[PDB]
Amino acid sequence: ESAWGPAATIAARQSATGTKTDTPIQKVPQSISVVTAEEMALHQPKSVKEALSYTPGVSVGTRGASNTYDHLIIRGFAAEGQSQNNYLNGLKLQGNFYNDAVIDPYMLERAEIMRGPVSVLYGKSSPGGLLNMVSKRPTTEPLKEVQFKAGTDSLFQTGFDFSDSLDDDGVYSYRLTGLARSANAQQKGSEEQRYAIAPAFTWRPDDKTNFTFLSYFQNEPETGYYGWLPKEGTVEPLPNGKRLPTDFNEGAKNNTYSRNEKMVGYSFDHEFNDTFTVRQNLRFAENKTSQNSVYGYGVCSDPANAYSKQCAALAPADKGHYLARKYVVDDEKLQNFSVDTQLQSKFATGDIDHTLLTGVDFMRMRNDINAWFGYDDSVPLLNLYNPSSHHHHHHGSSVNTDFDFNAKDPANSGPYRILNKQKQTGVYVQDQAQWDKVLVTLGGRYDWADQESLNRVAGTTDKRDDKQFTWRGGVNYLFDNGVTPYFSYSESFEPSSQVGKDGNIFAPSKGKQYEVGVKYVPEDRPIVVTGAVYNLTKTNNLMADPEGSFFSVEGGEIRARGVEIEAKAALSASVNVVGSYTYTDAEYTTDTTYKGNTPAQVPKHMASLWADYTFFDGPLSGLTLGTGGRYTGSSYGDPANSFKVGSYTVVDALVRYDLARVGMAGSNVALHVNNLFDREYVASCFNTYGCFWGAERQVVATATFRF
């Protein structure tokens, strides 16, 4: 009935991120979720992150109110370094250090999250999973959209989406999506600004051929808050019994953070005859980032400030209500090129049909870093006692003061100049073989992953080339009542970039996952229900030197066993629901300093559930009301597990009015409120000095008009 209904449910039955062939989800041997454009058009997520909010096995809010990155912890793990493991159009948006790129969800057609290992199809990748976003492409029918938004915290967004054919047959079409946004961050003194234009052009010379040029250009002068808060004044009280308020900001007042993104590429597909289709996906990007940032580093009483002179210089009983701060100045610039070429051969073997994928994937990334870091006594301290007042929780925080980012005292501060390079060439093969009600997926990939690192300050150079194989295989049994039981085994690998006591770069870490579960994907009614349970293991995790040095040592091992269930269904033509539940038991299996502990930021239990009700009768016709709940279980705030961050439940809702009924059909007006009950929670902590206030209640009005 309404866009995000079953038209959405069913469009999402289909995917490709999991097999690199266009396959429906019950024929996919691995856990995979899909979120459609109609859905983001309903929910209006600030980022790709919120877009996956009702999906299992993923924490999307770890960093709370910050929006700088779309970082996701999946099935308990994150990538080498805490780097994003994000794809756009099947190709990796490879970043490095603070140079990580994001794509606005207004420019997306869909997003898919693939859980567990997938090196079998993409190369070095985090066990845990990967995120694949898909660019809006030119439309068959015309589209002329203009959208306006006004919200709390001074959000003003203006954007458009126009697509048309240049000929009546449509061999030529384009799309141009753009947006201008600005708001002030939840934290006092921080703002956000974004400018983004995505020009796309499709060429279908006929119907067995498609070349779509995909481009994206984004400028962000200000990215906003990305600071660190002590568990003291957030999770826990300050010695005075109080807390830092949710809008508090430990940074300078002249803290500045910016990103620049430009990309050009294309998606290409050509079906030659009945057995041979070829597709090539390619992209080039040049992205940049800068920042001047003063950041928190815990209270003076925190182990991490043992050696801080401004901290030792205080009354023992004060140490725990004062804040050590550091800083960084960064300038970076990277280029990333990618091409994946694949040949799909469909054919039979008697009563056995095959879809045989064979392809070569390549990328190179270069990132040039030139920064400077304040060490132990590089910046003033802060008394969290004034901040802590009820005055402030009530009449707001107060900006701090400037900070000379140029006076770089060699005393307490240093330069960091690195030039990183990565290359990976992989060849993979896979077959989806179906013999009646059996679908068997199996293939493997081999990778040449080479890196090189130059340290311009030490004038030194670290290199390592890895050579890796990974494979995966599984079966999905297809029952026509709509029941697809499946299971499989899969792997992934990930090079280290760290260097050990012997002056060398450690070896790769690896991913090993056993998964089984079933998928209820009924062809008659608009419902999808999936359930899965899995054993995922990461080996060769870098750990602490059993012998007290400043180097890590390898051989560590972490395990995540878990359960995930997702469910989406139209319940009546006016009621739709979607929701999930996740159970993740993650464990340090082999570790110098932590066997038995669970890793920070990952809850044992999480869940979410959403419902929308649309009204087609009476005088409330074309009025949608929806509301949802997101449950985040308790979690540890440090590898030591010395403390815990608590469970929370945020409630979101909207009311949308289908303007249609005043002529303007296809237009609509909406009102969205996130964290309806304006709850105060700490999102997570990655350590005792690294904590994050969750997002305080937001209100946004959106008017989207279709000419």
Binding site feature residues for ferrichrome: 63, 82, 97-98, 226-228, 295-297, 373, 695
Task: Identify which of residues 405 and 681 has a Cβ nearer to ligand DDQ in the complex.
Answer: 681
To ligand DDQ, the closest distance from the beta carbon of 409 in angstroms equals 43
To ligand DDQ, the closest distance from the beta carbon of 282 in angstroms equals 9
476: amino acid identity, one letter: N
Task: Identify which of residues 91 and 607 has a Cβ nearer to ligand DDQ in the complex.
Answer: 607
What distance in Å separates the CA atoms of residue 221 and residue 315, rounded to the nearest whole number? 42
To ligand DDQ, the closest distance from the beta carbon of 465 in angstroms equals 10
450: amino acid identity, one letter: D
To ligand DDQ, the closest distance from the beta carbon of 643 in angstroms equals 17
In sequence order, what are the beta bridge partners of 157?
149, 181
What distance in Å separates the CA atoms of residue 5 and residue 568, rounded to the nearest whole number? 10
Give the footprint of ligand DDQ on this chain (CB under 6 A): 339, 341, 360, 362, 423, 425, 579, 581, 605, 607-609, 629, 631, 633, 647, 649
To ligand DDQ, the closest distance from the beta carbon of 236 in angstroms equals 18
To ligand DDQ, the closest distance from the beta carbon of 528 in angstroms equals 15
**What per-residue string of b and e applies to 264-283 under the rule 16 or more CB within 10 Å gives b?**
ebbbbbebeeeeebebbbbb
Q: Phi, psi at residue 282, to the nearest 5°?
A: -135, 145
Please state the residue numbers annotated as binding site: 63, 82, 97-98, 226-228, 295-297, 373, 695
What distance in Å separates the CA atoms of residue 216 and residue 200, rounded to the nearest whole number? 9
Kindly write down the DSSP assignment for every residue of 571-605, as one continuous string.
EETTEEEEEEEEEEEEEEEE-TTTTTPPPTT--SE
Task: Identify which of residues 103 and 518 has a Cβ nearer to ligand DDQ in the complex.
Answer: 518
- Which is it for strands 91-92 and 86-88: parallel, antiparallel or unpaired? antiparallel
In sequence order, what are the beta bridge partners of 474?
441, 488
Task: Identify which of residues 339 and 507 has a Cβ nearer to ligand DDQ in the complex.
Answer: 339
Contact at 8 Å (CB) between 175 and 165? no
To ligand DDQ, the closest distance from the beta carbon of 427 in angstroms equals 10
Q: What is the number of helices (H) and of strands (E) in the chain?
A: 6, 35
Task: Identify which of residues 559 and 605 has a Cβ nearer to ligand DDQ in the complex.
Answer: 605
Distance of CA 69 to the CA centre of its chain: 7
Contact at 8 Å (CB) between 322 and 299? yes
Task: Identify which of residues 129 and 579 has a Cβ nearer to ligand DDQ in the complex.
Answer: 579
Half-sphere exposure of 684 (CA within 13 A, CB side): 23
Contact at 8 Å (CB) between 566 and 602? no
To ligand DDQ, the closest distance from the beta carbon of 693 in angstroms equals 19
To ligand DDQ, the closest distance from the beta carbon of 55 in angstroms equals 13
Task: Identify which of residues 626 and 633 has a Cβ nearer to ligand DDQ in the complex.
Answer: 633
What distance in Å separates the CA atoms of residue 635 and residue 642, rounded to the nearest whole number? 11
What distance in Å separates the CA atoms of residue 674 and residue 45, rounded to the nearest whole number? 10
What distance in Å separates the CA atoms of residue 149 and residue 704, rounded to the nearest whole number? 8
To ligand DDQ, the closest distance from the beta carbon of 40 in angstroms equals 20
Task: Identify which of residues 175 and 283 has a Cβ nearer to ligand DDQ in the complex.
Answer: 283
Task: Identify which of residues 589 and 649 has a Cβ nearer to ligand DDQ in the complex.
Answer: 649
Task: Identify which of residues 593 and 634 has a Cβ nearer to ligand DDQ in the complex.
Answer: 634
Task: Identify which of residues 118 and 567 has a Cβ nearer to ligand DDQ in the complex.
Answer: 567
Contact at 8 Å (CB) between 234 and 243? yes
CA distances from 638 to 146, 243, 542, 642, 692 (A): 45, 20, 16, 7, 13
What distance in Å separates the CA atoms of residue 61 and residue 64, rounded to the nearest whole number? 5
What distance in Å separates the CA atoms of residue 407 and residue 327, rounded to the nearest whole number? 12
Query: 3-state DSSP call for residue 122?
Result: helix
To ligand DDQ, the closest distance from the beta carbon of 139 in angstroms equals 29
What distance in Å separates the CA atoms of residue 704 and residue 179, rounded to the nearest whole number? 13
To ligand DDQ, the closest distance from the beta carbon of 606 in angstroms equals 8
CA distances from 258 to 100, 215, 287, 619 (A): 11, 21, 11, 48
In sequence order, what are the beta bridge partners of 599?
none
Which token pair is 273?
A: 């005859």
Q: Where are the beta strands (DSSP E) in 319-351?
A: 322-349
What distance in Å separates the CA atoms of residue 26 and residue 32, rounded to the nearest whole number? 10
Using CB atoms, what's the residue nearest to ligand DDQ?
A: 629
